[PDB]
Short mmCIF file of C-alpha atoms and ligand atoms in Angstrom, two decimals:
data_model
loop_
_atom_site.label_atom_id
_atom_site.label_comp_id
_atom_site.label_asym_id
_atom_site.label_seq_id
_atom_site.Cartn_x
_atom_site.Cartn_y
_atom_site.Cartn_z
CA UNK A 254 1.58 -75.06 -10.11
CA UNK A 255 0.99 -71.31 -10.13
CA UNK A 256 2.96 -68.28 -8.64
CA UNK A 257 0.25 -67.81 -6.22
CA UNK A 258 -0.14 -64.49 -4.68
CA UNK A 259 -0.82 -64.65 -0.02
CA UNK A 260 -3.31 -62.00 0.16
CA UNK A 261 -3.67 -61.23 -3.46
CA UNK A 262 -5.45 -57.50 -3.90
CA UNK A 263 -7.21 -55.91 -6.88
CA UNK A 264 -8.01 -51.83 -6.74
CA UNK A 265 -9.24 -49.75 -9.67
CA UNK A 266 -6.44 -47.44 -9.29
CA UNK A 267 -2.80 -47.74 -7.59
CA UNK A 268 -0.90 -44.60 -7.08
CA UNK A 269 2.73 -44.75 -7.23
CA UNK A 270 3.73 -41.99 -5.07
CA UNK A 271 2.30 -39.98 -1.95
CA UNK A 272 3.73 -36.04 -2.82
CA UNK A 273 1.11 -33.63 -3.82
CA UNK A 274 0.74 -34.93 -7.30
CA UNK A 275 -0.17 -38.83 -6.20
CA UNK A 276 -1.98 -37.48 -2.87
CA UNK A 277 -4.17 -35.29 -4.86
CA UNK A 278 -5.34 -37.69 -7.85
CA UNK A 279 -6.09 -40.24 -5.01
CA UNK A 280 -7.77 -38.34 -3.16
CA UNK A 281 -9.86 -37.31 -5.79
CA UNK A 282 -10.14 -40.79 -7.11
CA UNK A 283 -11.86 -42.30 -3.72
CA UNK A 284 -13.98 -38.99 -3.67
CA UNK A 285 -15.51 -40.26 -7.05
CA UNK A 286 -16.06 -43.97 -5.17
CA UNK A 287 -13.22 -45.74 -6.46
CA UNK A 288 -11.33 -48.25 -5.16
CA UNK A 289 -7.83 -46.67 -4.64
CA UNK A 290 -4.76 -47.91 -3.49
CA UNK A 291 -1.46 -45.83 -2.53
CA UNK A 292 2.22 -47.02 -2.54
CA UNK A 293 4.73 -44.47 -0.80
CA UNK A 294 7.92 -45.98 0.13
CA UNK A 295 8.68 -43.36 2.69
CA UNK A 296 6.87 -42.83 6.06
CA UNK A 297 5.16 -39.08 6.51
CA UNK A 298 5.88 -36.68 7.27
CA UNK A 299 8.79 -36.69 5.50
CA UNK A 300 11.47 -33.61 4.24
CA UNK A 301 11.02 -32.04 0.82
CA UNK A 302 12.15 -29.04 -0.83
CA UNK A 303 9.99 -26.80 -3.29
CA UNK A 304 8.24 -24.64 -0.37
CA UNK A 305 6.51 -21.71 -2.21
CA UNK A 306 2.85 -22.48 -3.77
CA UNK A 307 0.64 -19.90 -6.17
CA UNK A 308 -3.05 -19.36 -6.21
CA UNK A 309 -3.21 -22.37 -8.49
CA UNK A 310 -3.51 -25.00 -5.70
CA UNK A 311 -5.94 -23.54 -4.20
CA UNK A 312 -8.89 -25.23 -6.57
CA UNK A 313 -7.48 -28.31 -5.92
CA UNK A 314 -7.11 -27.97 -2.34
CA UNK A 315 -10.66 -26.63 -1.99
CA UNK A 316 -11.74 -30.06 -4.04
CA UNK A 317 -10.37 -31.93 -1.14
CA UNK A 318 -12.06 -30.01 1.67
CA UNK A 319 -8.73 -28.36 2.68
CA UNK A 320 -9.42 -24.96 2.94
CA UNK A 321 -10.06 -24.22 6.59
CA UNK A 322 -7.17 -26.92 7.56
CA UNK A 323 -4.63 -25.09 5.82
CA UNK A 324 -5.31 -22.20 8.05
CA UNK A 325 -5.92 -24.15 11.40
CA UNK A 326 -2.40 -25.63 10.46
CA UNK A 327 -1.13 -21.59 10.46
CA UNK A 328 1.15 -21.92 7.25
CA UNK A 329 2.48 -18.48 6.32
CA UNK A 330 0.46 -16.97 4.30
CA UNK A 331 1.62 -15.77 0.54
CA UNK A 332 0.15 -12.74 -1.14
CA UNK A 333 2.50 -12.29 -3.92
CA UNK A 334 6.48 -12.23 -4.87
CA UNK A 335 9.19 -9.71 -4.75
CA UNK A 336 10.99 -9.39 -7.94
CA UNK A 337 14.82 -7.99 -7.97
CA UNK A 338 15.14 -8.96 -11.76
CA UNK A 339 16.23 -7.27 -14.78
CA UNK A 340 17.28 -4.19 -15.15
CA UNK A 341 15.36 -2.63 -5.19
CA UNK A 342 12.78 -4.91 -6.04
CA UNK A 343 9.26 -5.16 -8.38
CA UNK A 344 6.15 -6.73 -6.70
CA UNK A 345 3.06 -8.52 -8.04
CA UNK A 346 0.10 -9.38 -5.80
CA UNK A 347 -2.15 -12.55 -6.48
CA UNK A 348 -5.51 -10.47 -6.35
CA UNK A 349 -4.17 -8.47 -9.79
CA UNK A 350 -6.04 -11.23 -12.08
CA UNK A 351 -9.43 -13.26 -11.17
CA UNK A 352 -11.16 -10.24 -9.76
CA UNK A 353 -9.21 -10.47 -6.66
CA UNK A 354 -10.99 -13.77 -5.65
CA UNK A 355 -7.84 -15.17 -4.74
CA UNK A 356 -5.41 -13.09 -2.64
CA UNK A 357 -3.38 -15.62 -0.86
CA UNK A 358 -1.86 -18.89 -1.44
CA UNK A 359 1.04 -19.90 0.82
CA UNK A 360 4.91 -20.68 2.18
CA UNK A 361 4.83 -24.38 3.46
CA UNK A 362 6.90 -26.39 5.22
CA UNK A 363 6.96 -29.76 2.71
CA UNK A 364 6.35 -32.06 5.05
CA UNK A 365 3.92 -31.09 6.79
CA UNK A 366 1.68 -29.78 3.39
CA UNK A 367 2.60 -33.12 1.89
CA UNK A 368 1.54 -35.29 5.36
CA UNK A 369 -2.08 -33.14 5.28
CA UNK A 370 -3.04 -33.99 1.46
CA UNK A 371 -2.00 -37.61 1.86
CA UNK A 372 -3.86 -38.03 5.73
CA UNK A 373 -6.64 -36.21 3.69
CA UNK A 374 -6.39 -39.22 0.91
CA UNK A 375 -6.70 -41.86 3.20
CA UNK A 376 -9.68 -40.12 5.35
CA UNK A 377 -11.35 -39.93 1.82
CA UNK A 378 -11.11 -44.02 1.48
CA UNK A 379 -7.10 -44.78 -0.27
CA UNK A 380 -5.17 -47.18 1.43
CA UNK A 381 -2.23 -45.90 1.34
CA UNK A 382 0.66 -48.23 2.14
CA UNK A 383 3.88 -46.60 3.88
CA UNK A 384 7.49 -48.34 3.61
CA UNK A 385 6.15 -49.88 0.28
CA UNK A 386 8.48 -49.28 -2.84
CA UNK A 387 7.27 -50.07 -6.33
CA UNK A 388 9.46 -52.03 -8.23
CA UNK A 389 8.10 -52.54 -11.52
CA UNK A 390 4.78 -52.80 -13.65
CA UNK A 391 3.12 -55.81 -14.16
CA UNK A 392 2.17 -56.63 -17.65
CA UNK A 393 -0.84 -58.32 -19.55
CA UNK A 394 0.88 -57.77 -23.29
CA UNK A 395 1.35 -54.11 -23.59
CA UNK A 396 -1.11 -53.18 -20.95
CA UNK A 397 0.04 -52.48 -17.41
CA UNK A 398 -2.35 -54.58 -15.32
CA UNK A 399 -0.55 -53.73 -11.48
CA UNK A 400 2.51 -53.68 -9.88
CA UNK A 401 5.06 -55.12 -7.90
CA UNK A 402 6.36 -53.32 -4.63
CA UNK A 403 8.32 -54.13 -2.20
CA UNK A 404 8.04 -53.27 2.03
CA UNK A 405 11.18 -52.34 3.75
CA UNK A 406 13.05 -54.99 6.05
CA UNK A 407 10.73 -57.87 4.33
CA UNK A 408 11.65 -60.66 2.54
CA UNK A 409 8.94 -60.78 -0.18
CA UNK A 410 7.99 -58.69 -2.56
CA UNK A 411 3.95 -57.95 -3.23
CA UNK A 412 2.22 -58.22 -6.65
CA UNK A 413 -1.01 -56.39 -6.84
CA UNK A 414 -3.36 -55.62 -9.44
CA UNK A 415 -5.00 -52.51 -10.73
CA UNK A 416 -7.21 -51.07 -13.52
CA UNK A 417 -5.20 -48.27 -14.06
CA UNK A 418 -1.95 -47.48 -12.51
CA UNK A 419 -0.71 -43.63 -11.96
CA UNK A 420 2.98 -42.67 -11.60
CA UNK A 421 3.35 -39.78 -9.19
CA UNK A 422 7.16 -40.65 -8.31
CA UNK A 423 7.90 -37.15 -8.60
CA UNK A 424 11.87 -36.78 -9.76
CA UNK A 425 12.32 -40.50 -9.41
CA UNK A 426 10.47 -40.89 -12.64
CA UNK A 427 9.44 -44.50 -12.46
CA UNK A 428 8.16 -44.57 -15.59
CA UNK A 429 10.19 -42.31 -17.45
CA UNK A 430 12.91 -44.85 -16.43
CA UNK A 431 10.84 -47.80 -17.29
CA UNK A 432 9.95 -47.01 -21.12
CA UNK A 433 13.09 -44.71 -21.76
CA UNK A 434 11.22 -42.12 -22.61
CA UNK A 435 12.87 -38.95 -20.46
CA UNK A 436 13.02 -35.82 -22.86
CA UNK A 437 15.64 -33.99 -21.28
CA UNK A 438 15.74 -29.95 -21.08
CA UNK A 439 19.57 -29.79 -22.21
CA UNK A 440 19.71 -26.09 -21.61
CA UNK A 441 18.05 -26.29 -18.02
CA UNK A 442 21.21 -28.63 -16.74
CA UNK A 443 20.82 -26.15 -13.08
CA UNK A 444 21.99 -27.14 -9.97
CA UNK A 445 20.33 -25.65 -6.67
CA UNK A 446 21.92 -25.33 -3.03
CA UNK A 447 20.47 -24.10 0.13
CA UNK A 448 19.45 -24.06 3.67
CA UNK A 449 16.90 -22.87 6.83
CA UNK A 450 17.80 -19.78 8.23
CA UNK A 451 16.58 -17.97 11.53
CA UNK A 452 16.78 -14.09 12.38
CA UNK A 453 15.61 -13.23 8.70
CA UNK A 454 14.09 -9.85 8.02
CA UNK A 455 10.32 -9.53 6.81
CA UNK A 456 9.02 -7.14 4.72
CA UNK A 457 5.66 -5.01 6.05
CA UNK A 458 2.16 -5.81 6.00
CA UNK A 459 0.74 -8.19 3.53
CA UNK A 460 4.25 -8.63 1.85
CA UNK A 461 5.79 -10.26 4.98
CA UNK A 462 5.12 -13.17 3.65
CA UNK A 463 5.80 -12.55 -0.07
CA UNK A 464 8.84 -15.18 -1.62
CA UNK A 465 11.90 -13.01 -2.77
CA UNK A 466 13.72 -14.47 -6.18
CA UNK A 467 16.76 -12.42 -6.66
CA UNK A 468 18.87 -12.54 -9.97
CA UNK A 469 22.95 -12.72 -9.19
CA UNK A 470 25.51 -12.24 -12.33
CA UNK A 471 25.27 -16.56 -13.44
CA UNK A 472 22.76 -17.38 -10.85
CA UNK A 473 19.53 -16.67 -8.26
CA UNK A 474 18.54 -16.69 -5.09
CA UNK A 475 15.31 -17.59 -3.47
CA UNK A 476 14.58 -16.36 -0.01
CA UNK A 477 10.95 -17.94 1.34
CA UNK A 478 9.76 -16.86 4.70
CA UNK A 479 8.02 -19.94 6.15
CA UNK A 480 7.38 -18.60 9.55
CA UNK A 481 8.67 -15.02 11.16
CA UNK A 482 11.84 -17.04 12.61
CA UNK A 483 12.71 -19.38 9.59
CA UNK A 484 13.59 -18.62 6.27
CA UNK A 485 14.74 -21.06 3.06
CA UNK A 486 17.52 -19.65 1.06
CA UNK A 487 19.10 -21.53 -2.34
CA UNK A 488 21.13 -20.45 -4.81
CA UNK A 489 20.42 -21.66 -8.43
CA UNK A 490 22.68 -21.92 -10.96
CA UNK A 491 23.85 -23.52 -13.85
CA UNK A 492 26.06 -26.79 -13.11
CA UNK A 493 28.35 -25.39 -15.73
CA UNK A 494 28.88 -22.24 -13.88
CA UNK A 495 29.21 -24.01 -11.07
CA UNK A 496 32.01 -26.26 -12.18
CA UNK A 497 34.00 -23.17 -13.48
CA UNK A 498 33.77 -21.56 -10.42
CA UNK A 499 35.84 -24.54 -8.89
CA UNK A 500 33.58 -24.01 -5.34
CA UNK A 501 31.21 -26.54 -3.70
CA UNK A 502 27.98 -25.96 -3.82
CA UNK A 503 27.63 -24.73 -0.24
CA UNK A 504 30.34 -22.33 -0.43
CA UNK A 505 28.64 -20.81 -3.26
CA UNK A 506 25.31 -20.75 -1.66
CA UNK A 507 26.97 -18.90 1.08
CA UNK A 508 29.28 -16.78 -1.19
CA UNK A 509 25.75 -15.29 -3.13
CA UNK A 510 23.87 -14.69 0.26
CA UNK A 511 26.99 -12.78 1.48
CA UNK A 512 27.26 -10.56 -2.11
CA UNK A 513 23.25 -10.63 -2.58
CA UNK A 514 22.21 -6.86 -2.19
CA UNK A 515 19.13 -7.39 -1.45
CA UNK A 516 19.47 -11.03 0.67
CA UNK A 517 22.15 -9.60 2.10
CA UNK A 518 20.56 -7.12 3.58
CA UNK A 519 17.69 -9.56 5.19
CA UNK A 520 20.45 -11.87 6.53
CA UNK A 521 22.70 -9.28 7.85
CA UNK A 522 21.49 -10.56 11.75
CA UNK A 523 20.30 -14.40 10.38
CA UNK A 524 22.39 -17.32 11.24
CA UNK A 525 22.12 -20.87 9.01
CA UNK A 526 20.27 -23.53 11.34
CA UNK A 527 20.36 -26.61 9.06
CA UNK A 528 22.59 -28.84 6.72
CA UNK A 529 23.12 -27.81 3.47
CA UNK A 530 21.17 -29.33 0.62
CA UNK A 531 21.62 -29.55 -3.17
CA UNK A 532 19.59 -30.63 -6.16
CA UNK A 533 20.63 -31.19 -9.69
CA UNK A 534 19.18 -31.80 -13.28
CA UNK A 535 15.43 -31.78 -13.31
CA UNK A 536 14.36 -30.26 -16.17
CA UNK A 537 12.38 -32.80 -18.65
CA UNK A 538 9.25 -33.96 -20.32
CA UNK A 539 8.54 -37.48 -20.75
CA UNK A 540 7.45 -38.55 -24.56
CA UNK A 541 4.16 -39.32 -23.19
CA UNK A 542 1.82 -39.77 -19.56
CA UNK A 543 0.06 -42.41 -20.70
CA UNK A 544 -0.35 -46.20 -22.35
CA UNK A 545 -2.97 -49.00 -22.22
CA UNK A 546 -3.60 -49.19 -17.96
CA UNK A 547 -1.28 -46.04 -16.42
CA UNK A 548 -0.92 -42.39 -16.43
CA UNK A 549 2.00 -40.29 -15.26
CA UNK A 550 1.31 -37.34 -13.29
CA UNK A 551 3.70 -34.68 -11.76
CA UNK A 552 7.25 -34.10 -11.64
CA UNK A 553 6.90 -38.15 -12.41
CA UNK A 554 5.62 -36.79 -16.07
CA UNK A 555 7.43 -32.97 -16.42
CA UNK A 556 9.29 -30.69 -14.53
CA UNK A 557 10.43 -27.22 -16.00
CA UNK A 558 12.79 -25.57 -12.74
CA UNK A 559 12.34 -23.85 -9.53
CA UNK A 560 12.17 -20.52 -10.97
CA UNK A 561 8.69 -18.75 -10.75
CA UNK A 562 7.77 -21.59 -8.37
CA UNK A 563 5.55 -24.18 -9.75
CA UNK A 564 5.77 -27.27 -9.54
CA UNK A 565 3.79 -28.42 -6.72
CA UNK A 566 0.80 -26.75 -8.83
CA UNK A 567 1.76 -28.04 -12.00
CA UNK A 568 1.11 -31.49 -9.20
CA UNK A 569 -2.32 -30.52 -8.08
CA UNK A 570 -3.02 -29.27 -11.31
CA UNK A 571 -2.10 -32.89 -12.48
CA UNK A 572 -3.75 -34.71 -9.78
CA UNK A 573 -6.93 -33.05 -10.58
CA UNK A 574 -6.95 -33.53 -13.92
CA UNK A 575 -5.84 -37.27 -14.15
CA UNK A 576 -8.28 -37.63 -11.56
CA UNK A 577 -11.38 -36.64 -13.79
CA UNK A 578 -9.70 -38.82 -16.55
CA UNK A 579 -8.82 -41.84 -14.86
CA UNK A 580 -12.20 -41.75 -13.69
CA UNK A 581 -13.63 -41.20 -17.18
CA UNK A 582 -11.42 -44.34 -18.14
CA UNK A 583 -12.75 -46.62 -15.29
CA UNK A 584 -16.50 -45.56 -16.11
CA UNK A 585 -16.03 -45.68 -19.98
CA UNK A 586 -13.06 -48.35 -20.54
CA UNK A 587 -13.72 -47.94 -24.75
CA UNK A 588 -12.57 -44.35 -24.16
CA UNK A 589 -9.83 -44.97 -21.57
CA UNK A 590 -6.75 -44.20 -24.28
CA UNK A 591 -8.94 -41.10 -25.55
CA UNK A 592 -9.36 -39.71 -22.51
CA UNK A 593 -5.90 -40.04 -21.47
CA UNK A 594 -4.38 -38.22 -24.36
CA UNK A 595 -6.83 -35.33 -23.79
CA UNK A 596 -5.33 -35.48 -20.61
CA UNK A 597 -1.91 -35.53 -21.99
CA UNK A 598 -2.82 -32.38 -24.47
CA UNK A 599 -3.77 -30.38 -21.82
CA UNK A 600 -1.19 -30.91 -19.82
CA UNK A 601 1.04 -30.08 -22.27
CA UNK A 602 -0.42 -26.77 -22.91
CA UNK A 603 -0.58 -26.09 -19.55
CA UNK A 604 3.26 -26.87 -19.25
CA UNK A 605 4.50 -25.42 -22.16
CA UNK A 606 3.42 -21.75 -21.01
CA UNK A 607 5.77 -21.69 -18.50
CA UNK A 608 8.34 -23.33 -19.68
CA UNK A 609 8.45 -20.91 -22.82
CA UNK A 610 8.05 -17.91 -19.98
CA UNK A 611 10.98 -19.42 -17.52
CA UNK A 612 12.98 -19.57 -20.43
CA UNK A 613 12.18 -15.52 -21.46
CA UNK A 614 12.37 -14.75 -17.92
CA UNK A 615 15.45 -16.46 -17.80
CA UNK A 616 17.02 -13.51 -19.50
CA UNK A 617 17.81 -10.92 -16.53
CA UNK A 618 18.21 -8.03 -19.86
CA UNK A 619 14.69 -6.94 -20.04
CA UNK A 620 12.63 -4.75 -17.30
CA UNK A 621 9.53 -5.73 -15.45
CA UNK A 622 7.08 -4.52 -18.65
CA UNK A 623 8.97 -6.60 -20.85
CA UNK A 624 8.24 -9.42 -18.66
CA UNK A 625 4.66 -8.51 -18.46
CA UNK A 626 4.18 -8.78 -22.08
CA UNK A 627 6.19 -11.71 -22.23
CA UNK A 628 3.58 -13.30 -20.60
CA UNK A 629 0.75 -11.13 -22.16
CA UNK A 630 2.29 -12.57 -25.59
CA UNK A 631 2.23 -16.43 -24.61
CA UNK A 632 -1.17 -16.95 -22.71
CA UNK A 633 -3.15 -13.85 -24.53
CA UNK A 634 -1.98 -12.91 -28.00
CA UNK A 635 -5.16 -10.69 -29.01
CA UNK A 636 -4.47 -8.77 -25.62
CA UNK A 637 -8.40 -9.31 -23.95
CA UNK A 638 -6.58 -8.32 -20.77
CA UNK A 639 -3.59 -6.00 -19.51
CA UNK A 640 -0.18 -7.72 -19.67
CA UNK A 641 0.73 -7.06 -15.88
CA UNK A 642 -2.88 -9.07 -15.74
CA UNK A 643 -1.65 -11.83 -17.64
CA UNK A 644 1.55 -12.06 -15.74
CA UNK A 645 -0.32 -12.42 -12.81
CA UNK A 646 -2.61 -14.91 -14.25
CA UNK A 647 0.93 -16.56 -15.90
CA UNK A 648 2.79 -17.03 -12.77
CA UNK A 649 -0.32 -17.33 -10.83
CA UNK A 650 -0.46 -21.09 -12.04
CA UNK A 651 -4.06 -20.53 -13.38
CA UNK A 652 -4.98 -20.30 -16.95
CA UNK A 653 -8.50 -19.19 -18.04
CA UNK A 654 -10.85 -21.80 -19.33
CA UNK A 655 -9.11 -25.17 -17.48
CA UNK A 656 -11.79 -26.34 -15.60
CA UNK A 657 -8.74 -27.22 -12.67
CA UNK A 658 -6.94 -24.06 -12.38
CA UNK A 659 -9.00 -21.27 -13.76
CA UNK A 660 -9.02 -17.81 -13.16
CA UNK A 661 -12.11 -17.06 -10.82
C1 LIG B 70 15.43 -26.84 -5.57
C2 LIG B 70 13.95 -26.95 -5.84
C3 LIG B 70 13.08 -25.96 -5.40
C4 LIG B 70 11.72 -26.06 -5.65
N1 LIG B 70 10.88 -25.09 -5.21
C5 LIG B 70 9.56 -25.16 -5.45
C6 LIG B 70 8.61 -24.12 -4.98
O1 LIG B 70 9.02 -23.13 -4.34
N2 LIG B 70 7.31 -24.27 -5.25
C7 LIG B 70 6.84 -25.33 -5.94
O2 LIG B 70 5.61 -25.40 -6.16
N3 LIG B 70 7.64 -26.32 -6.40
C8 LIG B 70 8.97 -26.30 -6.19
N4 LIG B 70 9.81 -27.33 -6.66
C9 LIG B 70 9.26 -28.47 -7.40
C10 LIG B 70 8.48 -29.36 -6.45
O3 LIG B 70 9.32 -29.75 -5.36
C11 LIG B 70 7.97 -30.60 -7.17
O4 LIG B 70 7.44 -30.23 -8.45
C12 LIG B 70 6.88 -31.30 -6.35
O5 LIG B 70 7.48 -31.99 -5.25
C13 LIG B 70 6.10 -32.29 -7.21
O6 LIG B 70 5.44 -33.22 -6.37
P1 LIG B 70 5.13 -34.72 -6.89
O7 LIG B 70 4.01 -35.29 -6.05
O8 LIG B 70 5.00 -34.67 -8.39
O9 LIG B 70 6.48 -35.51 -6.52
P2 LIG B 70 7.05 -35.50 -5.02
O10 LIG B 70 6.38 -34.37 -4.27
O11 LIG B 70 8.56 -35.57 -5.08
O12 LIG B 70 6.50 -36.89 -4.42
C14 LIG B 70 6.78 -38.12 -5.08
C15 LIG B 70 6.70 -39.27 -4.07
O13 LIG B 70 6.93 -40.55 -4.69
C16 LIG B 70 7.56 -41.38 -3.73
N5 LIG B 70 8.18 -42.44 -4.53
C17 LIG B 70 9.12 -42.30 -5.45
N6 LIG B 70 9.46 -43.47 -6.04
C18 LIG B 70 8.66 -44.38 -5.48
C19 LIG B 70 8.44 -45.81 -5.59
N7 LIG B 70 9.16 -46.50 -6.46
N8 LIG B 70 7.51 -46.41 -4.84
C20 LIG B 70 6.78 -45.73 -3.96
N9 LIG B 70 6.95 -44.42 -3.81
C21 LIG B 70 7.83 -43.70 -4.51
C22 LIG B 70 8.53 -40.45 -3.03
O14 LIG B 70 8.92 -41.00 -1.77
C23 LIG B 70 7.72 -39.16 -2.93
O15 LIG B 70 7.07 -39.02 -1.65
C24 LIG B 70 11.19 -27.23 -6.41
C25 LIG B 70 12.06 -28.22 -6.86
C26 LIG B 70 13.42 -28.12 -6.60
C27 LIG B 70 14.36 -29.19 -7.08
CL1 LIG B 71 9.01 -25.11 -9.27
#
């Protein structure tokens, strides 16, 4: 006899993971006429923090015809970030770098941005499986040939098999867990605390919907307007400075809005309307995104912290780019560890821009020029452009000459 698999599948690609990251790369996948299949073990749409996107999606999200939807949907839209950091606050607008091509990204309700890309994925040709958990990789020697998932409430568990296989478990890190391989950021051990607030106060014109970050004396607040009657708040601070404080999270949280000048002020008439949530300790790198049949993408392969607001296009960023590899991998399976550390490379330099400029910004010493050529200083060290230019391209999430996320 044989385990014998009821119903056994084969895809080209399985993506672990439905979030922006895993939506994305599928998406893109079945665009290119693969055979794509999707495990998320939650049903959508489904809650998620990390609400404020920068022009940097917008390539991506343009890629996957969502353009128009993401104004029929009536997100808020985002034309830059208030700054009270360093030494009443400093403002950037998106349109400062790519000759003003972009001018808006947006404030988005995670559930509802996550439900569109991964609707979006299937309409493009992924099956994408709901309730289904991935358990762990299936193996032919060192390569990963599939995996093994399990459906919620049922007995047996599923193997299936697939080409290549793509992590996109966001801060689950499947993989990272599997191989061991989590490269932790010892100095970014943060914790983060907050809640939905109504009666918020928006700023005028084209900065009503502008995200505020505001530094506190061990700490920062975010304050993201999602719609005019609901607002996000956290608090982010070290868990060290936390624990010395001897207060809960939530009493913090509400302890910095109350002190905040300049949330304060915006939440003298609000009133909290939902639980508080926390977060804690996702700052890493894995040692690498990639082996003989899988790829990580996403918070699944790095996350640097909330601060300067990120992640979801370091995601799409990832998405697209493991996309065009995995494809080049499927077409060209000589090249298919080649590719993938080109991948990996880029990502990397990608990555490591911020994280080097969310650790300088980090520092709440310097003023707004010293942040500006901060940036100017990472991502152009011969100076072809103004610095408050390349802090705009910087926290933009662009970066000239990637063909995912360049500056238009
Ligand atoms: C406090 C905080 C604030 C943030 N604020 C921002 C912000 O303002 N802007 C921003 O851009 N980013 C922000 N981020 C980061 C952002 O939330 C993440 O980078 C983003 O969610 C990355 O998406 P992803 O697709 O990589 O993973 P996710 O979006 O987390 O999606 C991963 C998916 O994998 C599924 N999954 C996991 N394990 C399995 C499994 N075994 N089988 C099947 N499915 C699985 C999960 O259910 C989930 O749907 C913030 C993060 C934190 C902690
Ligand atoms: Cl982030």
């Amino acid at each position: 006899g044989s385990h014998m698999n009821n119903g056994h599948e084969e895809y080209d690609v399985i993506v672990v993971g439905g979030g922006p990251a895993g939506s994305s790369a599928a998406g893109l996948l079945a665009l290119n006429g693969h055979s794509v299949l999707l495990l998320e073990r939650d049903k959508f749409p489904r809650y998620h923090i990390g609400e404020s996107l920068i022009t940097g999606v917008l390539p991506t999200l343009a890629r996957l015809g969502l353009t128009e939807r993401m104004e029929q949907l009536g997100f808020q839209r985002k034309y830059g970030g208030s700054l009270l950091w360093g030494k009443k606050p400093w403002t950037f607008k998106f349109r400062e770098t790519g000759n003003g091509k972009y001018e808006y990204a947006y404030q988005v309700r995670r559930a509802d941005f996550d439900a569109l890309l991964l609707d979006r994925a299937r309409e493009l040709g992924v099956t994408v499986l709901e309730g289904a958990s991935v358990k762990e990789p299936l193996f032919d020697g060192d390569r990963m040939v599939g995996v093994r998932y399990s459906v919620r409430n049922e007995a047996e568990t599923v193997d299936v098999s697939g080409k290549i296989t793509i992590d996109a478990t966001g801060q689950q890190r499947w993989l990272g867990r599997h191989f061991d391989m989590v490269e932790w950021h010892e100095d970014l051990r943060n914790i983060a605390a907050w809640s939905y607030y109504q009666g918020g106060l928006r700023y005028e014109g084209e900065t009503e919907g502008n995200i505020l970050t505001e530094n506190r004396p061990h700490g920062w607040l975010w304050y993201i307007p999602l719609s005019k009657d609901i607002t996000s708040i956290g608090y982010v601070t070290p868990s060290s400075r936390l624990a010395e404080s001897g207060l809960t999270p939530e009493a913090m949280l509400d302890k910095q809005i109350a002190e905040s000048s300049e949330v304060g002020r915006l939440t003298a008439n609000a009133r909290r309307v939902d639980i508080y949530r926390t977060a804690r300790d996702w700052s890493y790198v894995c040692e690498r995104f990639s082996g003989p049949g899988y790829a990580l993408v996403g918070d699944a392969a790095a996350f640097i912290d909330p601060l300067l607001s990120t992640g979801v296009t370091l995601a799409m960023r990832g998405g697209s780019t493991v996309s065009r590899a995995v494809h080049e991998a499927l077409v060209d399976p000589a090249k298919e560890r080649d590719t993938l550390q080109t991948y990996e490379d880029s990502y990397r330099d990608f990555l490591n821009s911020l994280l080097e400029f969310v650790r300088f910004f980090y520092d709440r010493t310097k003023g707004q020029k010293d942040y500006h050529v901060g940036a100017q200083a990472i991502i152009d060290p011969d100076k072809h452009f103004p610095a408050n230019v390349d802090f705009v391209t910087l926290v933009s999430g662009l970066a000239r000459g990637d063909d995912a996320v360049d500056v238009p």
